[PDB]
Amino acid sequence: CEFGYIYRLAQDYLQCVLQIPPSKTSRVLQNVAFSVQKEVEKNLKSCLDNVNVVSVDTARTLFNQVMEKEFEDGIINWGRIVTIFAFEGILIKKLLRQQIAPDVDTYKEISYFVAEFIMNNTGEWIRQNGGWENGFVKKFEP
Amino acid sequence: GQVGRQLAIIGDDINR
Numbered sequence: 404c405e406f407g408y409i410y411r412l413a414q415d416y417l418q419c420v421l422q423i424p425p426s427k428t429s430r431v432l433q434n435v436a437f438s439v440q441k442e443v444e445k446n447l448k449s450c451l452d453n454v455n456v457v458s459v460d461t462a463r464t465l466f467n468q469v470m471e472k473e474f475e476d477g478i479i480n481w482g483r484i485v486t487i488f489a490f491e492g493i494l495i496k497k498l499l500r501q502q503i504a505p506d507v508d509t510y511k512e513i514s515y516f517v518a519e520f521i522m523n524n525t526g527e528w529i530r531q532n533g534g535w536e537n538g539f540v541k542k543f544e545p
Numbered sequence: 546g547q548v549g550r551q552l553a554i555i556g557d558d559i560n561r
Contacts, residue, residue: 435559439555439559442555443551443552443555446551446555447548447551450547450548451548468549469547469548469549469552470549471549472546472547472548472549472550473548473549473550473552473553473556474549474553475549476553478553478557480556480557480560481560482555482556482557482558482559482560482561483552483553483556483557483560484556485556485559486552486553486555486556487552489552490548490552
C-alpha cells in the first residue's frame with residue numbers, strides 16, 4: 404500500500420492547491436506543507452520566475468533535478484519531506500498558468516512522480532521513523 | 546545549489 408498511499412497524499416495536496424473538491428495525515432500535511440509553500444514562494448520568488456513549466460515533462464524534469472539537489476547530502480527528515488509537497492504545489496501552480504496544452508488530467512501524473520521520488524528515495528527512512536501515522540502525524544499534529 | 550539547497554535549509558528549519 405506504500406506507493407498508493409503517498410500517491411493519495413500527493414494528489415490530495417494538489418487538489419487542495421488547485422482548490423478543487425481526506426485522512427487526518429493528509430489534513431495535517433496540507434496545513435504544514437501549504438505554510439512552507441507560501442514561505443518558499445516569497446523567498447525563492449525571483450528565481451522561479453525565470454523558469455517556464457510549459458509541460459508535464461518539464462515539470463517532472465524540474466522536480467527531479469530540484470529533489471536530487473535537495474537530498475544529495477543524504478539527509479532525510481520530516482521537515483524535508485514536507486518541502487517536497489510544497490514544491491509540487493509550486494509546480495502545479497506554474498503549470499496551470501504556463502502549460503501550453505492545458506490537459507486537466509496531467510495533475511495525476513504529477514502526483515505520480517512525486518510519489519515515485521518519495522517512495523524510492525525516502526520510503527525506507529519514512530518506515531524506520533514511524534510512517535505517516537506514527538511518524539509524520541505525531542510530530543506535526545496540533 | 547538553487548532551489549534544492551533552499552528547500553533543504555527550510556526543511557531542516559521546520560524539522561527542528
